Assembly symmetry: D3
């Protein structure tokens, strides 16, 4: 047990899927995991562990923002022996040619935060994902007939940024999606030596204002989860 996780060593698997919403963690456990048991709920941040096709896989929320997820990722890595972390979430798109429901693989993650600068003596630290985990995800995605876009994500600190012009800048450099924690998870991974990956589904477009229809929204969410779980399977063999 750590200050933010009421669990003991062994209660978590070596790989953890982390959605933002703790309730999404509940859903994944009850929909894709077999014999899933609740391993944590300290601050309502539900966490579960179970088996997917015979492999033990844990699921837990990470809260909103880099500060939130950084805490949870550090403890899991340090006190629970977690080796691989896969974040599953949503992102908004700036690129017009990037449509809704598109699966985005965060090879790297640009950011608004200063976390990386504090760690890297105010130099540019490229927050990147693990090559093998990205590869596995790509291979697992196309196996399901889904075309995933491997590229740059943008981790924002402020969901409500006062700098509108930044969207134009993001588009010019081709960031695939803007979310709020990929870069942080990557910093934490590099610092404590673990492997990480962030997979997102474009839920809404900053330009062509439109969100996914609830039904299709949940369908694509499940496609993403399948992609994640399958990549893990593909990753240990």
């Amino acid at each position: 047990a750590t200050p933010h996780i009421n669990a003991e060593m062994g209660d978590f698997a070596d790989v953890v899927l982390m959605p933002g919403d703790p309730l999404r963690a509940k859903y994944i456990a009850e929909t894709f995991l077999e014999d899933a048991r609740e391993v944590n709920n300290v601050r309502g941040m539900l966490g579960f562990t179970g088996t997917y096709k015979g492999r033990k896989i844990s699921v837990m929320g990470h809260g909103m923002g880099i500060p939130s997820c950084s805490i949870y990722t550090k403890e899991l890595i340090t006190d629970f022996g977690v080796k691989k972390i896969i974040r599953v979430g949503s992102c908004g798109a700036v690129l017009p040619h990037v449509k809704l429901r598109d699966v985005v693989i965060g090879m790297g993650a640009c950011t608004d935060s200063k976390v990386n600068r504090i760690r890297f003596k105010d130099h540019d630290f490229a927050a990147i994902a693990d090559f093998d985990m990205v590869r596995n995800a790509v291979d697992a995605a196309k196996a399901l007939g889904i075309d995933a876009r491997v590229g740059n994500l943008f981790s924002a600190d402020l969901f409500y940024s006062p700098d509108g012009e930044m969207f134009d800048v993001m588009e010019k450099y081709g960031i695939l999606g803007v979310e709020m924690e990929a870069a942080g998870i990557y910093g934490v991974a590099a610092e404590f030596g673990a492997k990480a990956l962030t997979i997102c589904t474009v839920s809404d477009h900053i330009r062509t204002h439109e969100q996914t229809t609830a039904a299709e929204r949940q369908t694509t969410f499940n496609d993403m989860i399948k992609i994640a779980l399958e990549s893990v399977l593909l990753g240990d063999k």
Copy 2:
């Protein structure tokens, strides 16, 4: 409703007390408020509205870190008409003379987050609280026989910081307590024209590694909620 709050205009009172833990919000609502009704539950971020000495008071968690609490605070103001936001929580003390169970009123808040610079054209924005709210808290505390320490808090972005040297700097300029969102809340209030204040209690001492036992923890927390509540009543005249 908002993308992070499943409530309607009118479901929230003009004053909202915000602890970090969703479960603490529920505790306050069920122990101090009368006829508390759940008004929010999207990501388990429980929100409740009730009564206190006739005064309509709301309580809701804000999560961990500046980016998390910033989203909720902004939505409560712009979408639910909240006028005053009072953060209740705990902090770590760095100064030798500051002891556990001390009540710290964050008149100002230092931070290593870049959210303020993004807003203030990369200059120094003194994230400060509302004066009358600070004063109201000192009056309520004094009436309760609880001596309060008014000063600067430090909102860290990384609970697990790689820069252990910063604690010395903090001590050097006498920061009363270290926590994770005061600066962001003060940043939001100033941007959207609201009033904010963060009250904290010393739960641990950075230097002399002291922690409050479970019993004291609950006791001091109660004293803190008591202070914030009476504070609001004082501010009505």
Copy 3:
């Protein structure tokens, strides 16, 4: 004696009001103080010490800009035993709802300077005044029928700045007045463990370019100086 102050320990009272202009210090000495004698004049910075209602009080100029006043405050603190510093001055207003002749109290102070960042390892240091000194000033004010505006001031490094847009940002973030040293004084106070406060009178509106007349200037100045002296007495009770 110091390289900037030709006096010995005892020549200065424990509290010292500090106007910008040394000529204004001479004024206060002979208009408000009793038995006030000149204790310093090294660089024209006239310093005086006398009595107000039997309380020993000193008055000395601080020059224009943070680096200037930072020298005098530092020296008074460490070599002349000054406990409280109360800068009394003028400022310009950006907010339309802030009228000429208004007395603004600086609870916090933003700045274009880098001094704070040099001290605070490039982070965000909230340059704040002493709380007790703030309410004391506010109380003295109301005792004279004056309702002071308590908030953020902005200590500019450049009177003639090549950045006009900065005023707009100031307006949206509610800064009450633009002056040039509160931030520095607050930084010094925090570094050497002393208490400080800055009270200003709106001499002009930067937006609606309207200046206070020499007549109004006198009347408001007297009022402010009165407030500062009375607050001191309140702090002795």
Copy 4:
């Protein structure tokens, strides 16, 4: 022609291998390509275009440092239709487990330069390689029996950095090798919408000041050239 390249559009192939040294470019042209011809030489920066297994491929020196390689990469993309760019060079290792002769593939590239921040509104731009090109390079190496290391490189502006503590920070965050231009090339690629990748051989080890011998560097260099040329062929399939 451009101000730095005396060639007509069409003289370069859609893919360009770029070593730091122009003489090494000539070496690759005469040693690995068939019917290679000199397509540029304005400043001794030799540029050749020839064929490899029937595929048209160009080779051109890029010079030392981000400013030098940035000029060339941009011009090739914008005025010569170059689609892919592969930098081949050496790098020094700082991690204990990264041995000499090891082939390092820069999936990402950290940096000392301010070029990225100048493009990215002073935020963190994660300079990354093209996922497909990285994958192809890994497979090409695998087929040849070479175990490639995929990860983060560090592009330094100062070969002789007065800051030696940086090497330890690099070691702490797992950078695989330090060179001088990958981050710049990746920045240009993202700005002008092209594909890039840098492959390096570990020729020196910062910690245990060990270096490769004349024989070791010639042989390992050719292995790298093969991996690059083969990764391209693999990319057309």
Copy 5:
């Protein structure tokens, strides 16, 4: 008349000598100038205009610190048509081979201040002096039998800096002396197209805490003022 100078157009000569102490201005006027009249005295900042060998010259204090001297210089250039400014002052040395009483001419001026960055889009602005004025100052010195040292000065915002480590860096890069306004003057000069220069005598040593004696100081001061005056004559040709 300006917000800080009650003089009128024409009251100032095309060149002004600007010592730090307003009193030194008085001394210069009442020693090196004939028919000198007090054209300014507002904040005790004495400004006189006289004649030196038929050459009309003004002298005026500028206060201590970049913000102070920036105001006076700006107004003198913009409203009083002053074409050349010559700051005369003391400076502490850090280089061992620099001895007390030495005459240092600042061709350039490093700094801690953020004023330049605000002016230069956060880039590095080389705060330099006017060449001809430097060459003339060297010549005047030669004729007077003095060997002046031309190089970099360091204009510090903080006389009581929290980090003495910076002094080692200053030494490392051979800076001749540390004062508090050269960089601000040079910035204003460039911003408005005026010519400026700063001449300093080594009043003390940082490493070897040794201050110059008042006796030596007076004569040295006179030697420097003579240099600055002789140089003005050389520039008129």
Copy 6:
């Protein structure tokens, strides 16, 4: 001897002229030098050593950009005993009055780079030249009938910069010319206690793209070379 220069001790004169292009190095050596012998050719960076009017001098290219020239400069000073470096190149002019074919002497050098900040604890280092070398050049030019302009240059990192606005800020602050390495050389000269100077001729206007013929360029280039060479002889007196 060094990893970037395959020459030996004594093979270089204590002074070295450095054009950007190594082909130019060859040109200068075969047009102005007597018995010039090739001393280095490693990366095609042609270095020569000869005699001009009895005085032994060297010429060597430095490549494009601060990083490249920083490498060569450091090695010449620390490993080959070079006492002074003169960079001979071209620069684009922003000021209207600065005409084509004019000779600009960089007394100081503003920059886009972060190298100086790395060396000067993130403060403003005034990248300046050796005064003596500057005045010798202006004199050599005057003797040749050319009135050189002495002021500030801007050493840019990006030849193809996305921020087109910087050109107006430069214009406002009077920079004489834009180029890519002066601030870097001056930085190395300061770190290793050597003397440097950069002379440039206006090849074209960044504003109105006025382009001069290769013939006029050739001629003007030679004038600059003659000035640089003569100044060296004057430097021996």
